[PDB]
Ligand binder design. Sequence first.
Ligand SMILES: NC(=O)c1ccc[n+]([C@@H]2O[C@H](COP(=O)([O-])OP(=O)(O)OC[C@H]3O[C@@H](n4cnc5c(N)ncnc54)[C@H](O)[C@@H]3O)[C@@H](O)[C@H]2O)c1
Ligand SMILES: NC(=O)c1ccc[n+]([C@@H]2O[C@H](COP(=O)([O-])OP(=O)(O)OC[C@H]3O[C@@H](n4cnc5c(N)ncnc54)[C@H](O)[C@@H]3O)[C@@H](O)[C@H]2O)c1
Ligand SMILES: NC(=O)c1ccc[n+]([C@@H]2O[C@H](COP(=O)([O-])OP(=O)(O)OC[C@H]3O[C@@H](n4cnc5c(N)ncnc54)[C@H](O)[C@@H]3O)[C@@H](O)[C@H]2O)c1
Ligand SMILES: NC(=O)c1ccc[n+]([C@@H]2O[C@H](COP(=O)([O-])OP(=O)(O)OC[C@H]3O[C@@H](n4cnc5c(N)ncnc54)[C@H](O)[C@@H]3O)[C@@H](O)[C@H]2O)c1
Ligand SMILES: O=C(O)CCC(=O)C(=O)O
Ligand SMILES: O=C(O)CCC(=O)C(=O)O
Ligand SMILES: O=C(O)CCC(=O)C(=O)O
Ligand SMILES: O=C(O)CCC(=O)C(=O)O
Lengths: 406, 406, 406, 406
Amino acid sequence: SLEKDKIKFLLVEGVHQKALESLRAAGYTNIEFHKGALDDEQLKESIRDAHFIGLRSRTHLTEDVINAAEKLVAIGCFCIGTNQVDLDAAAKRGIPVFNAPFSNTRSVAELVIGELLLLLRGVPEANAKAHRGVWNKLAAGSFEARGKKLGIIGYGHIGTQLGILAESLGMYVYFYDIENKLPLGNATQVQHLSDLLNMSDVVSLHVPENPSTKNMMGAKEISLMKPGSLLINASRGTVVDIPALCDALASKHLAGAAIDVFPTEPATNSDPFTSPLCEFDNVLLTPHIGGSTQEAQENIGLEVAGKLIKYSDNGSTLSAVNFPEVSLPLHGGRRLMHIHENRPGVLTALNKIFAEQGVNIAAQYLQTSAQMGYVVIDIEADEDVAEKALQAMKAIPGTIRARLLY
Amino acid sequence: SLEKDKIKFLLVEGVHQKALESLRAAGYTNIEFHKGALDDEQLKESIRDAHFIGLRSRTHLTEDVINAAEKLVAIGCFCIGTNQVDLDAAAKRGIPVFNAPFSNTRSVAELVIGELLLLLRGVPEANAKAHRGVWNKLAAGSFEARGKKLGIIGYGHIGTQLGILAESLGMYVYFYDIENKLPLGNATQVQHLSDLLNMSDVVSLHVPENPSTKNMMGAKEISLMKPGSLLINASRGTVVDIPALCDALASKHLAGAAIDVFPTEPATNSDPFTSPLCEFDNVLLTPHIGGSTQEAQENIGLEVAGKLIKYSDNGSTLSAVNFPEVSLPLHGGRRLMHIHENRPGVLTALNKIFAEQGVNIAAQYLQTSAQMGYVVIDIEADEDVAEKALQAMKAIPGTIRARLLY
Amino acid sequence: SLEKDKIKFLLVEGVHQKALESLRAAGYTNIEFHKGALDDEQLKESIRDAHFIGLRSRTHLTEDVINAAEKLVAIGCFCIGTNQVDLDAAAKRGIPVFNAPFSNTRSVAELVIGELLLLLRGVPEANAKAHRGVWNKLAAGSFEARGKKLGIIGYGHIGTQLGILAESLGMYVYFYDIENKLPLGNATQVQHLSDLLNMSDVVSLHVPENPSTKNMMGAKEISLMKPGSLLINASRGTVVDIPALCDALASKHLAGAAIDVFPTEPATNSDPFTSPLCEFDNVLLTPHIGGSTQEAQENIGLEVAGKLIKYSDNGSTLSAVNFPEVSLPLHGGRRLMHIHENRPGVLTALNKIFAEQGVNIAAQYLQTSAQMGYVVIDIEADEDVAEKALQAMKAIPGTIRARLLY
Amino acid sequence: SLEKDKIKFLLVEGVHQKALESLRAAGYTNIEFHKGALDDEQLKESIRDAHFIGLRSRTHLTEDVINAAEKLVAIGCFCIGTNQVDLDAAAKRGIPVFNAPFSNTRSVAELVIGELLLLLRGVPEANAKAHRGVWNKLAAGSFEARGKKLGIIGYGHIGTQLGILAESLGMYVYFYDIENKLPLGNATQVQHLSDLLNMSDVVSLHVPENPSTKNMMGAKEISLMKPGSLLINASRGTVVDIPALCDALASKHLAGAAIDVFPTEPATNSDPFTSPLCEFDNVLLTPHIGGSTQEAQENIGLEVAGKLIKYSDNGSTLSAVNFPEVSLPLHGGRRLMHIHENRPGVLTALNKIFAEQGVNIAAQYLQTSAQMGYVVIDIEADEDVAEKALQAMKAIPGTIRARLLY
Ligand SMILES: NC(=O)c1ccc[n+]([C@@H]2O[C@H](COP(=O)([O-])OP(=O)(O)OC[C@H]3O[C@@H](n4cnc5c(N)ncnc54)[C@H](O)[C@@H]3O)[C@@H](O)[C@H]2O)c1
Ligand SMILES: NC(=O)c1ccc[n+]([C@@H]2O[C@H](COP(=O)([O-])OP(=O)(O)OC[C@H]3O[C@@H](n4cnc5c(N)ncnc54)[C@H](O)[C@@H]3O)[C@@H](O)[C@H]2O)c1
Ligand SMILES: NC(=O)c1ccc[n+]([C@@H]2O[C@H](COP(=O)([O-])OP(=O)(O)OC[C@H]3O[C@@H](n4cnc5c(N)ncnc54)[C@H](O)[C@@H]3O)[C@@H](O)[C@H]2O)c1
Ligand SMILES: NC(=O)c1ccc[n+]([C@@H]2O[C@H](COP(=O)([O-])OP(=O)(O)OC[C@H]3O[C@@H](n4cnc5c(N)ncnc54)[C@H](O)[C@@H]3O)[C@@H](O)[C@H]2O)c1
Ligand SMILES: O=C(O)CCC(=O)C(=O)O
Ligand SMILES: O=C(O)CCC(=O)C(=O)O
Ligand SMILES: O=C(O)CCC(=O)C(=O)O
Ligand SMILES: O=C(O)CCC(=O)C(=O)O
């Protein structure tokens, strides 16, 4: 309470107010909040003393920004991406990085729904023509979504939610996934992607970024799609062969697309964007905003404030992006934690401290990653016995950080 | 049917195939079908011997066209509008006009939902920018539709269906209507319009064209809207003060809008479109396509073919736009019908014909409308007797037209 | 009004208070109300001067009763059935009889839901045992209804509503009807009844009484049913061969049933009930209370009172069960009606009156049934002319009743 | 499954076939299956060499049976109850006991829906009467559930779900809970129980068994229920004062009830059931079958089999009922496991074994109960070496059991 006051959180790039509400609720009130991103002078000054930093996608925590922060304990990316942070550099210093990979789910699902509705109707091309003074009223080739088949590639957090939405609108939902998934509602798994692509009126992608998904929608897959169908990518920028898509659009094999993510994207809103897709009025182009709503920001705020509060209070590195994952349930007693290089005899040295000197260990959870190790230990002991054990632990060679949590 | 197969149907402007499937199923297989609209000296040609014509918005049935069409029995507008047809000229020749005023409801409702999804998310602005190479990634001001209030003005065919869909997406639905309607699901009627406009995040208009609705959305009504709300108009082009809309968009009191209908619309797709709204990237402009889908064309085909078929077969003029509405249930025997100027004791003359011939009249329905009268008569007689009766009927002063239906 | 105060409504057997509220709302305050049925004495004294009578099942309006009713204009059966009324006898006096055939829909549907839920779970039997002190706890043969197949025979007013409710509980809904129906929700028409019976976990019958449905669930059909399935009949008493059902229950081919209607039912609640089904604890037996709820009573009260009121106020006989159906839209002016035997010259006499009185007819709707005729006429004429014309009409040979409605 | 075939699963009392499907799918194929329970020598005979046993409520694993079960490794109760197992005899022999704590939420909720539908309609009494040949057709006091107010007491797993079903049926949902909960759908939390009771047409209980809950529905609370209402209890047998309920049934303050759980319940199905409630035909009495369905049995089978497989395969004791909870993520290498008396120095002796052989400990998770500890250890080492290590682990003082899992 007087000791949570010392614990500074630096929050930048205008994370959501529920982050700050979670912090204060947990007794953390020493907060330096900025709506904007910080130039370097300002970042380095504002971070020198910060125990925690929370950022979004534009703050760039390089190797050297990290070095400079002496108090820094953990990093929260209040967003999905973590490229902006040097993860090895943080890990080497016993600094876990957390993010929010799954707090954008509903925002993306609703986007795909709005977009496919308008695409099926030719509304993008008509709006584009209209704003340049061209009237293009017609019914031929425009369609209601009700009764049409949505083909969802990757039936995960978002695919799943999308399918539910689609069915509320009276669409028929099929999915393809590399795993066998349990369908929700009257969703149907399709074993082969070629089949999914043939049958679907709209195909939407909801997959990870990896070898298996890199240009998985190429010319072959695009031509397996139903004539006059529609492709929607708000997953990842590497999943569609964009030139192949341009050819399908130009040949009218597809009637439209909505693309929210691209192979290359502007670093800031000041930076110019270009895609060969720009020439097509029947394509919706959006600036990676599939998850950009206030509702999503809010879910993020809570989730990542939460992750940091829990690391701080009980040492949990569950979900950490660059760190051994450790979490122990809270069963009272005292809790210590120890971050280290995996040198011979660290663990030996640790349990020697307690055991040699009376102390029962109630619980212990160690996890490692290459030459990083992290262990959380619960002990049944006096206050001063714990404080002494801590000092001993800090001296074990290879020790990066040790802390008495409670 | 060796009579029905000589009843020519002229269908123009590529009405939906279901129109024709209906006709044929009903025994009417003599169908001259055109995908386009006809020049003059081929409309005159094709319609000279046509007993029925089905058309859409582009065929102008002027008085001259109508009076040169010798055999013309009825006219179907396979569309909402009837402005393209001279209804008085048709009436004066005993020719009923039918249309489809409510076959487009799911289409208009789905458009609005797609439009409000994207408007709430700033996507129209972003798309426009992106095609110009400007990247505008932000969450500020962007919202999921779930949990938001939709205010519907006009809780009729479309307003109702729209609220149902919105509720499916987890919106909260409210409506203002001048009449008191039973709500569907959890919709709520708002008594005062001021109160509905105050609470709404999105307001959508589904009202008829008249005195009560002309510019009902002026500067005053717009300013009562919640700051940062959205206005959608896919009802009628006279309902919104477009200048005052521009005011509120420029001032940023509204965050966007979607306008599908305008005070003055272009006559063809080759005529140019102007609006002050063309300057706002955050406005969706569409060319009166709210009901322009193939599924709507299907509904229209079925409906208006059904109205023609029924009139042909049984004399029903329900929903006729320019005629007294008569419909008589079927009970066998013969049916005859009489269209006449409204002079008195036409009914007298008629009932006299049958009394003299010893024919019992089983049922008879007369209705009158303006300077005009229409009666359908069920009698119990054979062929010769009914034909002889019919020739007598044709001879009555003020007779416009008469037929033996069965 | 001095008009309506003369117009006595005799209501017996305790129709819903909403009927009284409707009447009084419509200006009709002369009401004699009885909770029970009347003895012969009280019935003849009470109906002598009645313009309308509302009754239910028990009141027998025989030829002789009806002949004593000097003032009687119409009969309303505040129920489905009309056998308690001599309809030809009412017809000969020009007294239309109305009823309420579809006011019970929700109550029947809700009952089938409750019954199938408890049956699938073996509750009728477990409850029966428990009351006699036997504890029978088991999971074997008990099933949740979610994910099960309900087969509906007769997809009309009740079949439809039932399917909607079942789908709300996560059932799959299949139906067999003798005519092609449009499915609601995800319901599915099965063309062959044998297939529906093969697949269904619960079969429920919602068909009319006629040659086609007489013992249509016989031994054959019940053996086609799925093993361990359940049969529900709350349609009509003649539809299931009950001895065959008993055999299927005893052989355990079926796991239970719920019967609300029987080939022979008690006339009154004092009369004993017996069914060979009484032997089975896994059968729900109910005393024809499928439609017997206060909400149903209420719906009936509004419907039938409203039918009476419309006949009185505007002459409509739509849905009359024993009478020519006529109704004309209300377009102001004055309105006369004329009930008659179909004597030669009635109609020509009607005009002659309007000619020599100078009255222009705006609409006229005649319909006949056998030697019974009914015509409603709208005229443009002041009061004293309309009144003169009315007197002339009452004197046409074969006139049964003539009235000026407004 | 070379070495897995030696791992004998004994399943008694007819667990779902889904449990065996899970086992076979995990390579566990040596299964002794029984539909019933086993008598003593028959039990001791089958269990002696079993590595796992799956049972339900009737099989009593006493300290004597447990201590004779030579090869026994874990216990699966395919049910919620665990009192048939001596949890310490197990723990002290190093044997985790697993159960199924909520695999029946839908079954309870559906039961309540079915019950209230019929109670509202007076069907339990009509049915009972009908079977005795008494016919009671009436509409008085019978009600559709639609529009009625359901009052849920205890808005947890089952309460929540029940509210969702009820809303599907057009009911209004209210709940009382000792904590603030987030309502689902249009459910409404009521702060004072007395207000819930006064307003509810049907009251259903879904609370735990503790002192806050014992006879919480007493005379006072029932007297506060709405005159004519229905009480339902499928929660716990201690929660309703049963005599007070009988008073209220007899006085007709309540129109009916449905009771599934009783202060005292028959031990088996051949022991007699006694309740003053048996006199009442408008009470549904069921033998604690709220969660007794095949769907529940199937979920139980999956859950509890899965828990035994996971313990066998990877040593997870998550959700164990008598044991420290440990679960370590799989990351290859070898895994060992150690159960021991909770005393300082054990972990020190373990870690010393690996240090000596020059083997790195990749991860380890120790948790302690009161008297005992359990630790899972991941090492990077070949077969030979891990085996010599296991040998040494077994020899630590206080070791109860140790195993090389992979
Ligand atoms: N555009 C945006 O603003 C935005 C916002 C949020 C998330 N996303 C992205 O959406 C994608 C999906 O998100 P999520 O939360 O649903 O992910 P998820 O992990 O929950 O699901 C991804 C699914 O893809 C399946 N899958 C993996 N490889 C596949 C393959 N080659 N073919 C087919 N299916 C495959 C997986 O089995 C999994 O179910 C991610 O890349 C995520 O970062 C984008
Ligand atoms: N843009 C398109 O392509 C397209 C397509 C189909 C229909 N429409 C138009 O949309 C409108 C609505 O169609 P619909 O079938 O639902 O209409 P509807 O006639 O069924 O309902 C109109 C509703 O407005 C209410 N109302 C009338 N005046 C009002 C007033 N001034 N203020 C508030 N409420 C008022 C009425 O009570 C009624 O409920 C019509 O103008 C129709 O022609 C446009
Ligand atoms: N138990 C009760 O208290 C009670 C109450 C109200 C109604 N009912 C009865 O329930 C039945 C259904 O009522 P409703 O309002 O739904 O009637 P409905 O006419 O609207 O439905 C009957 C349906 O059955 C179909 N059908 C006719 N013959 C068939 C056949 N032989 N095989 C299969 N389908 C056939 C029809 O096409 C129609 O759709 C009626 O008999 C009615 O009197 C009973
Ligand atoms: N009939 C059966 O065969 C059977 C089957 C399953 C469950 N049950 C019983 O159902 C009951 C509820 O099950 P669940 O899984 O929903 O439990 P749950 O713990 O999820 O919910 C209990 C709810 O009760 C509330 N609560 C506790 N004490 C209260 C009090 N005095 N007043 C008001 N609210 C109170 C809690 O806040 C919680 O929200 C349990 O007793 C359970 O064992 C019986
Ligand atoms: O938060 C940002 O600025 C980026 C949006 C986001 O969630 C991400 O993709 O990293
Ligand atoms: O049909 C037309 O061509 C005019 C507008 C329209 O498409 C419709 O009436 O539905
Ligand atoms: O009318 C009755 O008295 C019994 C109920 C009935 O048949 C009905 O609801 O129509
Ligand atoms: O123990 C059993 O056999 C099942 C009992 C059960 O499911 C329950 O008590 O809810």
